[PDB]
Amino acid sequence: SYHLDTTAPPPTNLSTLPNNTLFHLWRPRAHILPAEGQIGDPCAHYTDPSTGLFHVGFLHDGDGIAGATTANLATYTDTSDNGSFLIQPGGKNDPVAVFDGAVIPVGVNNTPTLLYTSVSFLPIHWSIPYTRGSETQSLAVARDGGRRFDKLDQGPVIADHPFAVDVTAFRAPFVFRSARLDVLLSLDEEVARNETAVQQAVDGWTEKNAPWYVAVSGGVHGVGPAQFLYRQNGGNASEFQYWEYLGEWWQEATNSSWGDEGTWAGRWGFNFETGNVLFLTEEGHDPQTGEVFVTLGTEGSGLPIVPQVSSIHDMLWAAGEVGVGSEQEGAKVEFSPSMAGFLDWGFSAYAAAGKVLPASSAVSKTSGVEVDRYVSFVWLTGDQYEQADGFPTAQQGWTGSLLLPRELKVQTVENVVDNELVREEGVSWVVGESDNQTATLRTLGITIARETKAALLANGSVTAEEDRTLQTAAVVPFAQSPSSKFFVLTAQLEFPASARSSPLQSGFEILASELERTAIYYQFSNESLVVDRSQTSAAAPTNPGLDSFTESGKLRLFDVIENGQEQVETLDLTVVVDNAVVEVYANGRFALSTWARSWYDNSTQIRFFHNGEGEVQFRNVSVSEGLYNAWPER
Template sequence: MKLPSAATGLFLGTAAATPLSLRSSTLNYNMAPPNLSTLPNNSLYETWRPRAHVLPPNGQIGDPCMHYTDPATGVFHVGWLHDSAGIAGATTSDLATYTDLNPNGGQAIVPGGINDPVGVFDGSVIPSGINGLPTLLYTSVSYLPIHWSIPYTRGSETQSLAVTTDSGRNFTKLDQGPVIPGPPFAANVTAFRDPYVFQNTQLDTLTSSQSNTWYTVISGGIHNQGPTQFLYRQYDPDFQYWEYLGQWWSEPTNSTWGDGTWAGRWGFNFETGNVFSLNEEGYTADGEIFGTLGTEGSDLPIVKQLTSIHDQLWVAGSVAKNTNGSVEFTPSMAGFLDWGFSSYAASGKVLPATSKPSTQSGAPDRYISYVWLTGDQYGQAEGFPTNQQNWTGALLLPRELKVQSLDVVDNALSREEGASWRVESNNTDAGTVELRTLGISIARETEAKLLSGKPSVEAGRTVSSAGVLPFQHSPESKFFVLKTNISFPASARQSGLQTGFQILASESEHTSIYYQFANESVVIDRSNTSAAAQTTSGIDSFTESGKLRLFDVLDGGEESVETLDLTIVVDNSILEVYANGRFALSTWVRSWYANSTEIRFLHNGVGQATFSNVTVSEGLYNAWPERA
């Protein structure tokens, strides 16, 4: 996935950045909005800009990539594609506040070299690589357009090296050709990009490699066969040669995990594949193998247009040698890393316990992942006021990934095949099973910072009547975190119950967030989110949802429905919803009116629900204290 996003079109080239000019403060947010695309450039710069998220000072952010912990300083580096003109980045010592590596968010590496005359796509960093320095393996691009739906031009994408000697501010390309000069011989690929470097003890054993060998997966697919990941390993100490180990994981064209209910589609092409190993504490080199990946595809069996689906998935599985001696990855479960329509291109990195963020928080070795929230429907939001806003997209809050175990009642709900969990063991005497899935939560340092202000406590309540009930103490701003637990009676499973909240609410606007048992989903109804959507065609307002099963659990020996544990982060226009340590759904909520700050309890009048531990932490923090 590259800027200006090929999600639904071709990679055609670069887009010119809009010059930063004076920002208008003359807009009246107490009156109905005009057609925002007719306003002066930069007039909407502050209107929906988030405070606590990662994004450049201006322009378009793209795929997160190039993350690493600097061995010399212990700080964590976060990178991203920026304005189709290379990779920019920042450092953080606490996973909450960031410092730009270069003035005005400038890039650390740009296209224009002998290997990358037209593009620099995603790359991944070996923290102690050539001469012990951080070394970037990245996709060097020589030809455009590139898209999974058209014939591939040979030589379009190669993998090259660059090294930094100034703490990541600049990555200098090696004066040589690519270290991986193209796809495997005679492979009719859909793509060959986004190398991700990692280490794994299981692969060391299976491939008879030395300990701490570096591997890389390159994402893509094969025309008329399906998406795939190409596996390579380091061949020499200087990382000049990479040995091809085969297509270690492939799926049939546009197929699904199970029936697709819990993990979308594998699509026609894989992008931004990451590989790492986890246990219940976090990262461990000998843990269960997981991966995150973006999938490009179509809802149609035969593609008749370039519009595509983009699912941001995770997968877990095992590795073994197959009959021809090559290594093969076999999935055992899969799911969505984020259910949001605009959430894509996740990339992460191991954050060791010795890093500055982990040393301060006492955290163990972890895997931290960032997800891109594209701000313009992958470039397809016609009429979006891009020049008026002068920034597009953001990275979602950093997430800790780990193995999550659940003890639940042994019944049809827990035994479903093709789901985003698997049965690890069973206790016949107790009538329970242990489930395993991917744990997804806001990084602990980030969440602590989000909640650092004094919370406002709202009285708990049981609701059964249809309607909305305003909070006693709603926030005064559009920057807050709402946390709560919602419990349900067993009868809720057979009802049409819908319950949750309205946020960013006023007489003119509101966004509804609720859980419904009918299809076991967390729903974000944006049909009334923004008055601007009524005047500006590029402001999306469709409803988004993601599946979350609440299992039956034992509580004091009695069966009950698992409690819904919600964390809702509102950072002006960015909404992130987390649930039960294993669910995330993120989207844009571009409210217009200044007084759209109210929170309300919401219930549809079917059955009852009990809200407890309801708190609102208002204000959030400034993630960029050094920016003007």
């Protein structure tokens, strides 16, 4: 009889253990995930007009959308027991399955209304023929406080994909409002060609009565990934039955990519998934003044292609402009990217679903936020999108988790030396201004929702480390490491301009003991933050299900003028470890998340790391231990 003892070597085959034996071993305490079982794409979030509460949704066990609510964005309550499902398959419109959907706060009967993909046939994949009628978009209305969504007793409101278009996918509807879209669609084909006339109309746009837009994510066979745009018919904010097709407002060539190298924004792949239409400002989210941003997952593959398998799942984002529908019979409106990147560089991070969080929300009132925010929840698949090599699933009793809620806004990088590092082609930023001597850059800002970050540091024990400099290769253990796998690690690493050309690697080793360690370091060679998981788990060698491949993401440190002086921009790191869930944040404009399934309880040492190449200076290194409980009621 083998009882779990994590002070002793792991059994050779974890999959032989009894059910639920590994339930708590790698489970997080401050993240969003169901009480048990598997979690898929997060979805149906919305602020309830009546209560001001923020509702969170997510696919659960491949059997529908489950939910939970929060009043503070730090802590959550399940909407119900027995899975806490809001809506499940089996209706006339979704006999086979219920996929992602989005909510209009004041919809039918003036109640929260969910527009979702009702599935009638399987399988569905961009690499095989699409079965007509596979995915339609249906409506359901929130009842009993939103603890459940009742499907309207009629067929889908969008019963078919675009006429005669051979789509690769037609799902994940996302609703939004837009001053610019309303203006571009109201003005003349000629009167709307000039920003002057438009801007004047946008200034008068009134959100409260604007019509809703719907972006359905997908692609076209033999053509390319794309987003299909619709809007309440005739621009009638009161029309919920008929949705006029505005065309493929955004499409890219099959497996093409941002830039000529596919260096900063992966590839557009073969199919677009779970779109979000954001409107960001430097302070938050404004559908009247915000710049158009889009986050989406793209499904890619190497060659030869393996039918029904998407080998690459990129969690991307793009920003650009929207204009009138060229002159061709193309979309009435068109989104043109100016810059693009990754919302999260994690292999397993994917299907981001966010929502506008009004300053009028109970969450914001309580925390005192006076602007509208856009909160995004990234999915962290637990079994490499079901391609894991026999992960001990029955033993764990659950699969997957969502990452920490993140605030998305326009982030600026000031006092940046305008040089090659800034003018490169196909990057994740644009120059907002310049005098040819220094410039302000504009990119997507990615930060942990402020109430969540505060909650993480609420009751945490704080242990600081003295500023340090390393020149020769070295691994220096902290003066005091945490005694648990729940902590927030912060640190600033300063590099000399002479390091850009060096094969320098500097960072930390975490979750470490004699037989285990996880490395996190910056690498100038390819300007990337890297998470070496080759030694993360003592159990990985004999259990291939526990992926141990290296994770990395691109992060360029710009030459800037800090105190009237030039220097390589400081690497501002924040690593959050809710157990096996590791999230690496950098300079408010980067995120890389992965699983670090360390085995031993002793594996909690933290060390400074330097490979002797180049030089590094560590400043303001600190550790907050304990985090907090995201689900008190459980």
